[PDB]
């Protein structure tokens, strides 16, 4: 009771890697005389080899000093490997500070096995270099970098990344410039782009005649060409774009940016439309570059985002509309104060028709997520409390409220400045935030009061999204969540109606449901025509990257809508584009194979929920249709040999008869034992001495 | 809690007036009725347990979609009109429904029953994986499977083994529960089996142990019941009328098919009759692993030694073999069963079935 109550309420973290840590350092969690009582259990299970039942009593007492004293002699491999899947969570609560104090004893020895899983999860600087010390094979150092680079989370933005990615010659560092491209989505994403040329499906691309019909003509080309490069249709005819004017010209050029996605340099081909005559033509160029460079902060071999950042300055409107929205996508993973310093005075007056600052709240959320900055924390906090300029309407108030409900993830003591803005103005989405602060601060979740308390407020749109994230890691509230999702689907306001399909579309890939598609039938005509115009596009968001199969019931609903008017001809094209989006095969991944969570994919869901509402109530901008591409993760399963470089090798079959390096597949395991941390996705395999083969 | 304090609390205060008009129609002396037929004119048929069958008008309380023929509702002593519907969460509507998605049993874990796998795989997995092969021949793949033998070996293992490779949800329905306690629910439970599994249909329906309802005798009276014919006649129309690509599957189990209704068989819809095969060394070790897990055994006790010399016993005698081995330790007052008790109990059960087969034949 002394160590539990002292380690319960605190503003700091828990655990230390120092060898002289008795857990008496700093704040005193327990008396000095009572410390020897916890060590009395160590000599008991030491000779008896009771480590199986010794961990059971170690997690209940919550003592960080007991673990490093228990492990002394004999084998550090089999004994420590059992603690990998046992120690961190047996009980519903999560204590991550136990494995941190045991690093000092292993520092002189460690092992090839237990030092692997220590580099992921918390990911301390001493844990990553620990496995590199006992590994004398440069091949095994490569495999350890694939699971770490895909984790992102803590270390993302500039000042950490690309500084380590340079590299030198040493045994304790060994980060190659090629490993950053192989581990991270750099080289492998380009092979999938070229491999789609042979596997491409039929194309609906047509240019028609009239400019009113050229808007839907070029717009569908952006969805069809995702992951595909077609230079024949764009270069041969330049009239299918320029004929569009107003807000349609910006969305037409953005479709070309999807062609150049995952390319070395996409700015050269888009330079022709960068400056011609009219600002409306110049506006679409900025939105197209952000789509082509989305997913990579530094590019591949060159930082192509250096020139894009300098184009944000402009007194005009249509260009500034696509400058804030277009650039707020490709900058994920790269933090710079030059774009923040220029955007701060523009977002002060927040005038929609002139400066078009309404998208500044969504741009700052997708870029700076998972970063540490004192400039954006202080400036937005003062502007929110002062309520300066003309700000009155709740629309812009909810933008700054939901923008600050993101950046504080992965912070700790920096969250206290954000909490002042949350408790200032009450919001329906900010009531559930107070109980979710302990998720990131206490390093994990699953307590009774951290889940069930969210279900009482539901029986607005932010609380239902958090249920899907907690149910993936809990076997209790997961079964009862299926019933609560059906009652929240029918409600007066449209905010909760539009949130459910976005959350169910990810769950429904492996679990189709008839009740979800049947609601979308009556979801079209309800009250206002704005819901009907948004209903056609909402039914395509769930079927993105999938055709026929389970969607055959949903496909019949979109076939009855062709053209009911001049505008309906364009609206129905948005449904056909998402159906064939990515040549018919795509996916949505909110997590990775490292058993962690990415704050970028989570921030893209909250950003998409705020935007995209142009056809629905609260008209903002028609350029928000491309927001979905910011959160779409690639789908591939790689394979490697002992050389570490990409090479053709055969693995287990997928969903198409063989899977090579750079070919599409998802959720496929392997029976071959790898070197270090055999998992899904990219892995370096090996062959047993029994049979000798090159495949 | 905090969010709903400013929402639900002022909501119930404004909705209190509508609740006062309800209770006036509700009334204190309520009763439980029984539905028969629902018509769009707001009229129904209700019965209280003393059987005064009435006919009354349906008032406005809840949507008609919540009302289903054959259910229980609420009544009042004045006009005997329906004042509300009774909650069905406590009383199960079907007989026995257990939904098992992606079970543990597979084709490789059932032992030497592979001879039975080749027959069930062609009638289940083959039309599901490659439905286009039957379109060229213009034939309907049989959705039914007739199982023989005793439970615990052939019927229990193979039932859940087919759902693993086909990625199907296992539904176990007791066959002796097809006549359930009430008159008029025969055609209702038959539709609920195909209705729940008809929307999605990654599922295979399983039925076992029918000794009764398959026999209509010579009439529905003089010892017979009308509930027997309600389920049998409706099951024939639902199985023959409903055709699909091989998603929905219904598999029954019976020891003797001579007593079943030949009209219910409907030849050509179910072409699959699977016999019972004897377990090999692999299957017998699976039954022993369940009982010997909690049973105490020394390091000299091996599952391969017991199955080496055996009379090839069924699942009932194998379970009784380990049962008799435990009595030898109780008479000697010991908690640890040695290897001699398993060998001694194996010979006793083996000699209780077949020994000399009445030696003869010259």
């Amino acid at each position: 009771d002394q160590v539990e109550k002292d380690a319960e309420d605190e503003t700091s973290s828990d655990g230390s890697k120092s060898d002289g840590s008795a857990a008496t350092s700093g704040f005193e969690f327990s008396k000095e005389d009572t410390l020897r009582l916890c060590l009395d259990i160590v000599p008991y299970f030491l000779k008896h080899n009771g480590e199986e039942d010794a961990v059971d009593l170690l997690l209940e007492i919550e003592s960080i000093d007991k673990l490093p004293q228990f492990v002394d002699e004999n084998t550090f491999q089999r004994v420590c490997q059992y603690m990998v899947a046992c120690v961190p969570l047996l009980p519903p609560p999560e204590d991550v500070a136990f494995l941190k104090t045991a690093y000092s004893i292993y520092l002189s020895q460690n092992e090839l096995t237990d030092a692997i899983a220590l580099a992921v999860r918390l990911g301390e600087e001493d844990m990553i270099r620990s496995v590199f010390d006992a590994t004398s094979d440069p091949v095994m150092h490569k495999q350890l970098a694939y699971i770490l680079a895909a984790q992102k989370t803590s270390f993302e933005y500039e000042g950490v990344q690309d500084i380590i990615g340079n590299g030198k010659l040493s045994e304790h560092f060994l980060y190659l410039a090629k490993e950053l491209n192989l581990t991270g989505p750099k080289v492998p994403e380009d092979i999938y782009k070229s491999h789609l040329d042979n596997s491409k499906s039929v194309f609906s691309s047509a240019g028609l005649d009239s400019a009113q019909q050229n808007l839907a003509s070029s717009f569908v080309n952006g969805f069809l060409n995702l992951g595909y490069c077609n230079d024949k249709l764009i270069v041969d005819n330049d009239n299918w774009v320029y004929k569009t004017k107003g807000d349609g010209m910006t969305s037409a050029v953005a479709s070309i940016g999807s062609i150049y996605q995952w390319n070395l340099d996409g700015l050269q081909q888009l330079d022709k439309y960068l400056y011609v005559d009219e600002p409306e033509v110049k506006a679409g160029a900025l939105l197209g570059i952000g789509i082509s460079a989305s997913g990579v902060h530094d590019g591949e071999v060159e930082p192509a985002l250096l020139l894009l950042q300098d184009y944000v300055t402009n007194p005009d409107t249509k260009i500034s509309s696509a400058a804030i929205l277009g650039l707020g996508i490709a900058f994920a993973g790269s933090k710079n104060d030059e774009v923040l310093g220029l955007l701060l005075p523009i977002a002060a007056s927040t005038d929609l028709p002139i400066e078009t600052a309404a998208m500044a709240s969504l741009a700052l959320a997708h870029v700076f997520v998972g970063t540490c900055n004192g400039d954006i924390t202080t400036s937005i906090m003062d502007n929110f409390l002062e309520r300066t300029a003309i700000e009155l309407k709740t629309d812009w108030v909810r933008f700054l409220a939901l923008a600050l409900g993101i950046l504080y993830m992965g912070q700790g003591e920096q969250v206290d400045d954000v909490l002042e803005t949350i408790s200032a103005i009450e919001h329906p989405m900010t009531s559930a935030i107070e109980v979710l602060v302990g998720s990131c601060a206490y390093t994990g979740t699953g307590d009774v009061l951290l889940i069930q308390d969210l279900l009482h407020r539901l029986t607005l749109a932010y609380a239902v999204l958090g249920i899907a994230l907690i149910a993936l890691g809990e076997d209790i509230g997961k079964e009862m969540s299926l019933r609560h999702f059906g009652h929240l689907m029918h409600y007066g306001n449209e905010h909760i109606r539009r949130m459910v399909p976005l959350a169910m579309g990810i769950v429904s890939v492996s679990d189709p449901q008839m009740k979800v598609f049947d609601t979308l039938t009556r979801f079209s005509h309800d009250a206002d025509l704005e819901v009907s115009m948004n209903s056609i596009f909402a039914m395509g968001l769930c079927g993105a990257g999938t055709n026929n199969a389970r969607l055959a019931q949903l496909l019949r609903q979109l076939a009855s809508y062709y053209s009911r008017e001049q505008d309906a001809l364009f609206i129905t094209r948005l449904a056909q584009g998402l159906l064939h989006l990515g040549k018919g095969t795509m996916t949505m991944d909110v997590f990775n194979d490292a058993h962690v969570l990415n704050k970028v994919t989570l921030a893209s869901i909250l950003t998409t929920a705020v935007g995209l509402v142009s056809p629905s109530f609260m008209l903002k901008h028609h350029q928000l249709f491309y927001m979905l591409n910011a959160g779409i993760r690639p789908k591939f399963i790689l394979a490697l040999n002992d050389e570490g470089e990409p090479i053709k090798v055969n693995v287990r079959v997928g969903q198409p008869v063989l899977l090579n390096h750079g070919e599409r597949a998802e959720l496929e395991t392997d029976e071959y034992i790898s070197y270090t941390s055999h998992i899904e996705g990219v892995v370096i395999l090996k062959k047993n001495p029994d049979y000798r083969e090159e495949e | 809690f905090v969010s709903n304090s400013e929402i639900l609390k002022p909501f119930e205060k404004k909705q209190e007036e509508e609740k006062k008009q309800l209770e006036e129609i509700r009334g204190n002396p309520l009763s439980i009725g029984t539905l028969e037929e629902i018509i769009d004119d707001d009229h129904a048929i209700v019965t209280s347990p003393t059987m005064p069958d009435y006919y009354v008008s349906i008032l406005s309380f809840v949507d008609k979609e919540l009302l289903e023929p054959g259910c229980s509702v609420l009544l009042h002593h004045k006009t005997m009109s329906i004042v509300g519907v009774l909650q069905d969460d406590a009383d199960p509507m079907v007989s026995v429904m257990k939904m098992d998605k992606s079970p543990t049993e597979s084709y490789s874990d059932i032992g030497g029953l592979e001879s039975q796998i080749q027959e069930i795989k062609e009638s289940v997995e083959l039309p599901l994986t490659h439905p286009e092969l039957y379109e060229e021949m213009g034939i309907k793949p049989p959705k039914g499977v007739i199982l023989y033998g005793a439970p615990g070996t052939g019927k229990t293992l193979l039932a859940k083994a087919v759902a693993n490779q086909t990625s199907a949800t296992f539904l176990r329905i007791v066959g002796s529960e097809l006549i359930q306690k009430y008159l008029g629910d025969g055609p209702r439970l038959c539709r609920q089996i195909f209705k729940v599994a008809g929307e999605n249909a990654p599922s295979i329906v399983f039925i076992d142990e029918i000794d009764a309802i398959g026999t209509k005798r010579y009439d529905s009276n003089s010892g017979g019941e009308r509930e027997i014919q309600r389920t049998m006649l409706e099951l024939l129309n639902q199985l023959d009328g409903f055709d699909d690509r091989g998603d929905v599957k219904v598999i029954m189990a019976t020891n003797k098919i001579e007593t079943l209704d030949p009209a219910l068989i409907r030849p050509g819809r179910i072409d699959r009759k699977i016999l019972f095969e004897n377990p090999d060394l692999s299957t017998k070790k699976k039954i022993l692993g369940i009982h010997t897990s909690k049973m105490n055994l020394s390091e000299d006790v091996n599952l391969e030694t017991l199955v080496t010399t055996k009379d090839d016993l069924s699942g009932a005698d194998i379970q009784a073999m380990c049962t008799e081995a435990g009595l030898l330790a109780l008479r000697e007052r010991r908690m640890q069963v040695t290897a001699e008790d398993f060998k001694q109990a194996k010979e006793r059960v083996m000699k209780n079935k077949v020994e000399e087969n009445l030696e003869g034949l010259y």
């Binding site: 007066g492 309800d526 009250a527 | 509508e18 008009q21 309800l22 006036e24 129609i25 009435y54 006919y55 009354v56 008008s57 008032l59 406005s60 309380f61 809840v62 004045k78 006009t79 005997m80 009109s81």
Partner: peptide
């Protein structure tokens, strides 16, 4: 908007069902 019209069928009509239906059901139907 449509939430009131959904319950309106079971509220406004219930007032007419008090006098109208009970009179038609008089006589223990």
């Amino acid at each position: 908007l449509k939430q009131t019209e959904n319950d309106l069928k079971d509220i406004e009509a219930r007032i007419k069902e008090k006098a109208g239906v009970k009179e038609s059901d008089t006589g223990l139907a």
